[PDB]
Structure 1
Amino acid sequence: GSHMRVTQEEIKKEPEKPIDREKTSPLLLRVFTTNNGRHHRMDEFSRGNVPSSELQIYTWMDATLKELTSLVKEVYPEARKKGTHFNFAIVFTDVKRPGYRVKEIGSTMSGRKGTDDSMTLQSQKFQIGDYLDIAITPPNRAPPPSGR
């Protein structure tokens, strides 16, 4: 027949399907942005503590660091400022994890073509549900940028 059977095995192993950087689909992402550009720790901003901690960004895993520069800056006026130094990292909130996987993969700017900008998220192991911790540094306290 068809309904009744003994052996049950479905082969659906498909290779890695790349997403169209242009025709990609936007997905909800959680990002933690600080107003001092510091990778201190989660204690600075936990998940569900304040609205100024984690922000929603409809980005695409196959997005270039640049796209992330706008996504966050758009959801965070503190970044819209010119000369804003934001560092993209991967950190998780208080959970059943060790607490050492928190590291940065690259940092962009608000109108400044960096080296990581041309880089894509997919390379930083960024996927759906992933935890990205961006460190926004205003131009008022940014010694590197032009000023003094």
Structure 2
Amino acid sequence: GPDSMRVTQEEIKKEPEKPIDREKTCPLLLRVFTTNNGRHHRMDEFSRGNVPSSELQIYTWMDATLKELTSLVKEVYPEARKKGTHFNFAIVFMDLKRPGYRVKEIGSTMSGRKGTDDSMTLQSQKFQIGDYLDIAITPPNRA
């Protein structure tokens, strides 16, 4: 008859994500790159040992949410506080097949508006220390 077998990784039933005990966990250093041209940085900008020459560094935890992070970005780039400003987040991560980096868009938020990705966390998107965060910021109403 049919045999029992171990479940493959893709079909593994995972528990719901849990908050981090931030008081007992040393924060990670998150490197955030930003654009204002309407698109993410290209992967050629992360090649040959280089990164973009502007960046924001943040101490945070694996349960950091997109809204928490945009609040910090707004501290340094106040024009981005304008209601309707759009923040498009992507994780830039090492390419394991070829040299350099790859990118995966994860979600977006908007100044002054509640949205479905506001509570999306780094851990939910399998962010790893060593990865970069890229945020493409665009003005209200797709101006």
TM-score by length of 1: 0.64
CA contact (8 A) 1:89 1:134 kept: yes
- 1:41 and 1:90 mapped to 2: Cα distance? 12
Q: Which of the two has higher C-alpha Rg?
A: 1
Could you tell me how far 1:75 is from its partner in structure 2? 3.2
Q: SS at 1:102's partner residue? A: strand
In the alignment, the residues of structure 1 paired with residue 134 and residue 94 of structure 2 have an alpha-carbon distance, to the nearest angstrom, of 10
Q: 1:50 to 1:4 in 2, by over 3 A?
A: closer
Shift of 1:109: 1.3
- Aligned-residue Cα RMSD (Å) equals 8.0
Aligned length: 141
- What TM-score do you get using the length of structure 2 for normalisation? 0.66
- Listed one character per residue, the Cα deviations across residues 16-44 of structure 1 (whole Å, up to 9, x for unaligned) are 99613788654321111101331251456
Instruction: Provide closer, same or farther for how the CA distance between residues 10 and 139 of structure 1 changes in structure 2, counting only shifts above 3 A.
Output: closer
Which protein has the bigger strand share? 2
Instruction: Summarize the Cα distance change of 1:77–1:129 in structure 2 as closer, same or farther, 3 Å threshold.
Output: farther
Encode CA deviations 1:11-69: one digit per residue, 9 max, x unaligned. 99999996137886543211111013312514568899898732112222211221112
SS at match of 1:22: helix
Greater fraction helix: 2
Question: Which whole-Å CA distance do the structure 1 matches of 2:90 and 2:10 have between them?
Answer: 40
